[PDB]
Amino acid sequence: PPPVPLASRAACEALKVWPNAATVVEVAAWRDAAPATASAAALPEHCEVSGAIAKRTGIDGYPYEIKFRLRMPAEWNGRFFMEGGSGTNGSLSAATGSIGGGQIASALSRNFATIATDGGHDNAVNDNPDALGTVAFGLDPQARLDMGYNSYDQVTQAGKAAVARFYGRAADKSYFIGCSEGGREGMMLSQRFPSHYDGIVAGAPGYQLPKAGISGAWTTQSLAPAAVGLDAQGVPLINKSFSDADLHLLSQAILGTCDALDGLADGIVDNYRACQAAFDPATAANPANGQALQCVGAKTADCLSPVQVTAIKRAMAGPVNSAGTPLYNRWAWDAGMSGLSGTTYNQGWRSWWLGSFNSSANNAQRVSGFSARSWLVDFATPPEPMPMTQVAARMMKFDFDIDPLKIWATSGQFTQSSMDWHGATSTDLAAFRDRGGKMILYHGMSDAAFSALDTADYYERLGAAMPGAAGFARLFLVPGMNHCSGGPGTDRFDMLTPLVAWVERGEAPDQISAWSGTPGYFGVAARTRPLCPYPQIARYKGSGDINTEANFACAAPP
Ligand SMILES: [Ca+2]
């Protein structure tokens, strides 16, 4: 170690004995304290380190490396923090330690040491026009492994080595927070690298991500009979299957059936299990006029066509093969499929399977967007690159007896299947639990990227494999919330404070305070509610402002 003062500009610049011999530091710079902005809390004086691990050339001829950026405050609380990724990764964030939940404060603003990665590929460099753009890292077997698990492992090791050198000691505790692809990363770490992090938050976790494109092919083919018009490739316009007003009508019928099943009519379906048992859009009534939601004759603004009802029922049921065997899971009916704030309709559910209505092209993530592209090049083995203009047609032609098997296959130099390197389905968390690890899962009920019911099923399997699982892992479902944020629900919350309390003081979260980022969905200026540990739900105490968390408690469903 250099004979310089610890936690100083001198110790920072001297960083330019890494666990990986192929670690290259490109930046080691002292940063003055930065003021708060409209979108970020103030950042303390810190050392910023950025670089890359394992620079190489892939079998596709493209360059690959695992980029990292690390920030270590001069005034340090002894804690290490890694933020998770999003989408197909490929970008390197500011690495101030995002905590999600719509929060403005970063972990660095709370004096954590913070680190981020791009996952082993770079969207500016690994952009191959013959392999569907920024998903093209899937052409290289090692880049897939880096994306699945190896990049986060290498970056955790490098960050902890820099921390030990810069501060003269290891972190007292290590924390990981991620949502979406970052939630998958958190679950992966608990299963594959249980000693890396003491506390993990995994929001809307894509722990079976290679199956998402199977669902996407299914919802695309399910909605196609309800489409009106064709795109430039002659493929039905899935975005035209439901107008925004049509989706709002569906959400209002769900509320009519399900809102009060928790005891309180408030625009929120807290009793999601009772809703799934009760709601059927083919039999549900339109609560406003008592007429059936499904049109008895021609289409009006107050009913849904039988073709629409058949289509959305089939999409929500989930994909099956020719024998009727489920290939993913089903989806929960919930009011956050729509939502109206002023004159603005909620787009956060429909953008995934349908796309924007006001378009002459398909733009749903699951039809022609990045999710369909990622399945073809990243999760199917061998990869299936093709023109971008053929993706929607490929989803339309998807064969549920043949194509779903490709996420379990190996081929040539692809020696692991995508479920092998990307899936995180293990319930063997004994090592994580026994060393004191704590995990908070959360998931929005109206998430159209990954099914909240599928996360619930993992949590049930976890409890069955390990009695007393609530002592170290708890799941917080969020009614009305879309993917990681948004929707008619209480989608904003501070996950880091209860995580630290659980890890360091043994205080399990019996509830987590949340508030709505768009309270106009309920016609109010603010709404706060408790998030409740599965299988509990929020229960109104019977009197007082229904928009105040103090008038609610967590309880078993009625
Ligand atoms: Ca309710």
Residue numbers in the entry: 40 to 55, 62 to 603
Original authors' sentences:
PETase cleaves BHET to MHET and EG, and the soluble MHET product is further hydrolyzed by MHETase to produce TPA and EG. The structural conservation between the hydrolase domains of MHETase and PETase is striking, and despite the large insertion of ∼240 residues representing the lid domain, residues Ser225, Asp492, and His528 effectively reconstitute the catalytic triad.
The only other amino acid with side-chain positioning correlated with ligand binding is Gln410. When Phe415 is in the open position, the side chain of Gln410 pivots toward the active site to a position wherein the heavy atoms would be as close as 1.8 Å to those of Phe415 if it were in the closed conformation. Given the observed dual occupancy for Phe415 positioning in the crystal structures, we simulated in triplicate (each simulation 150 ns in length) the four combinations of Phe415 position (open and closed) and active site occupancy (empty active site and MHET-bound). A similar Ca2+ binding site was characterized for Aspergillus oryzae FaeB (AoFaeB), wherein it was hypothesized to have a role in stabilizing the lid domain.
